[PDB]
Scaffold this active site. Structure first.
Site, mmCIF file in Angstrom:
data_model
loop_
_atom_site.group_PDB
_atom_site.id
_atom_site.type_symbol
_atom_site.label_atom_id
_atom_site.label_comp_id
_atom_site.label_asym_id
_atom_site.label_seq_id
_atom_site.Cartn_x
_atom_site.Cartn_y
_atom_site.Cartn_z
ATOM 1 N N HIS A 52 0.965 -1.041 0.123
ATOM 2 C CA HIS A 52 0.170 0.009 -0.076
ATOM 3 C C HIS A 52 1.032 0.980 -0.095
ATOM 4 O O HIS A 52 2.158 1.222 0.406
ATOM 5 C CB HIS A 52 -0.833 0.052 1.236
ATOM 6 C CG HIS A 52 -2.001 -0.965 1.087
ATOM 7 N ND1 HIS A 52 -2.927 -0.909 2.258
ATOM 8 C CD2 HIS A 52 -2.231 -1.978 0.273
ATOM 9 C CE1 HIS A 52 -3.804 -2.020 2.086
ATOM 10 N NE2 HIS A 52 -3.368 -2.705 0.683
ATOM 11 N N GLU A 54 1.313 3.585 1.955
ATOM 12 C CA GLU A 54 1.999 3.980 3.137
ATOM 13 C C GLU A 54 3.241 3.260 3.371
ATOM 14 O O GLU A 54 4.257 3.592 3.662
ATOM 15 C CB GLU A 54 1.196 3.962 4.254
ATOM 16 C CG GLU A 54 -0.210 4.822 4.371
ATOM 17 C CD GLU A 54 -1.397 3.913 3.388
ATOM 18 O OE1 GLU A 54 -1.181 3.528 2.510
ATOM 19 O OE2 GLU A 54 -2.705 3.912 3.966
ATOM 20 N N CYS A 82 -5.398 1.848 6.659
ATOM 21 C CA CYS A 82 -5.993 0.900 6.973
ATOM 22 C C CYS A 82 -5.253 0.209 8.142
ATOM 23 O O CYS A 82 -4.263 0.648 8.834
ATOM 24 C CB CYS A 82 -6.021 -0.144 5.665
ATOM 25 S SG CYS A 82 -4.472 -1.128 5.450
#
Ligand SMILES: [Zn+2]
Ligand SMILES: [Zn+2]
Lengths: 130, 138
Positions: A52, A54, A82
């Site tokens: 992801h 991040e 998330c």
């Protein structure tokens, strides 16, 4: 304090991710007022569900700096992180987390498990949303 | 299962020797180990390099797929919050683990991720496999 610039770069990464059929989420890792890493989601491209935006910038910044953690760094993301990314942010010792809209379906900061407020979380960053 | 945990323990002890957190895991598909690894967060300057994610990444590279439906994951210590989420995303079928981790765990401990609305896929969970050895090596 060029936060508008930081978010703009993240938005660019988000748009690019969408164009390559990835989830349109982007992030930038900032250290001492400068962007040292930028990325959008790359899970499809890398056959890695952990890729992801991040986590991608956390890994990139750590490689650029040669360190296992990122104390003192700020992370800007276009959408609320998330559960997986929230925990990684905690492990990386990120100082401040800035993000756009909340993500009720899978978020873990202000939404979902609200990881940073749980007893099993041992490190939490400053959190600025919207 | 005995062989799978045996190998996971081998990885766990090796990780400890490398000054990493002594945790090991194996990824099984169709009754065969297709990936094995211990923690590598210090070696790779990557806090996401926990044994669980390492084997998911390796197995996905070996299969050339983004998800691992039908695969089972064996790990010596209860997965943490980050790994529990990754395990969900990878669509792991069954999760087997040894010792519980009340301090940072997220399966039976902590956020109990697989029971939360924000989790969209949960594996069947089995705990206590080779608990003594897993806990003995931290
Ligand atoms: Zn994420
Ligand atoms: Zn973990």
């Amino acid at each position: 304090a060029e936060r508008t610039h930081f978010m703009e770069l993240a938005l660019v990464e988000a748009r690019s991710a969408g164009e390559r059929d990835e989830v349109p989420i982007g992030a930038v890792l900032v250290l001492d007022g400068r962007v040292i890493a930028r990325s959008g989601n790359r899970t499809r491209e890398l056959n890695d569900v952990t890729a992801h935006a991040e986590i991608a910038v956390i890994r990139m910044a750590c490689e650029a700096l040669g360190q296992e953690r990122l104390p003192g760094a700020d992370l800007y993301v276009t959408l609320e992180p998330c559960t997986m990314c929230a925990a990684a942010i905690s492990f990386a010792r990120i100082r401040r987390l800035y993000y756009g809209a909340q993500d009720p379906k899978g978020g873990a900061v202000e939404s979902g498990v609200r990881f940073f407020s749980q007893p099993t979380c041992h490190h939490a960053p400053d959190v600025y949303s919207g």
